[PDB]
Amino acid sequence: QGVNIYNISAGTSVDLAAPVTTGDIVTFFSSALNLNAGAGNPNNTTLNLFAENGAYLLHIAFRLQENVIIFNSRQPDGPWLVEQRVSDVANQFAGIDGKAMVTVFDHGDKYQVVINEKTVIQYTKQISGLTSSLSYNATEETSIFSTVVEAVTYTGLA
Amino acid sequence: QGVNIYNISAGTSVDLAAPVTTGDIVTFFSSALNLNAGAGNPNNTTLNLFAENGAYLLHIAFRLQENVIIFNSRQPDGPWLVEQRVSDVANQFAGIDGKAMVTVFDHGDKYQVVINEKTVIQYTKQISGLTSSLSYNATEETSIFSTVVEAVTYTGLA
Secondary structure (H helix, E strand, O other), X not given: OEEEEEEEEOOOOOEEEEEEOOOOEEXXXXXXXXXXXXXXXXXXXXXXXEOOOOOEEEEEEEEOOOOEEEEEEEOOOOOOOOOOEEEOOHHHHOOOOOOEEEEEEEEOOEEEEXXXXXXXXXXXXXXXXXXXXXXXXXXXXXXOEOOEEEEEEEEOOO | OEEEEEEEEOOOOOEEEEEEOOOOEEEEEEOOEOOOOOOOOOOXXXXXXXXXXXXXXXXXXXXXOOOEEEEXXXXXXXXXXXXXXXXXXXXXXXXXXOOEEEEEEEEOOEEEEEEOOEEEXXXXXXXXXXXXXXXXXXXXXXXXXXXXXXXXXXXXXX
């Protein structure tokens, strides 16, 4: 039913005009894909889906030094739960250069992450609720994504 | 469930790797928005959703000379059915410049077109079926969209 667009600059967090609940979609667009980027410490780039209460419903990190994409969750004041790891970054982004896009479907119990056209994980949710906040911080000056990441949310799909 | 990406150059028509049936989504991205474009004859820009049989499930035209966005349908060898018109183009694209995006939801009986974040029409379907082809032709050298239009399809949503 609805389509929202957001310009998320590296380091920001935009509150959603409409929350991404079950059945909904959210895609992150990067007009750059720097996989040569220097040493990140630790997450060269993270993309998060928060709850109204700062709870990390999902944490998507990109670590080039560890050549791995990390997936996790955490209560607002709690500790990082059980990680997850998909190995070999560049190989997930193969297919498209110069740009990239990360799609996160919300299937109620699980978050399906898809990089470009390839599903990278069917991540089972640790924490729960509905996403009301997004974030895109480069935990070390060499984001594998462009200085700005567009974000489109397809909500009201139900 | 699935995410497909397509680079549709002005004048082309890409066959979908997966068809956009009911419940599915398809968004067109233009990295340019030329609303100053010259006289178009007649549709400065059209975006179509076809059936395997060349049937136009939906025709989205942009006419700057007529300052109107047209919506229609036609059998492969049939005539243009009952048109539809949303007036004042520039006003639909307000909100975002330099770029633009046209989203078409498929609600079985109706196609909801959304330009950027604004729903422009809840178009009731004349013809039926499922889309297997897309097209983006500039019916006169001054497309209001960039020379290339990315297209992302969110299918397998069911």
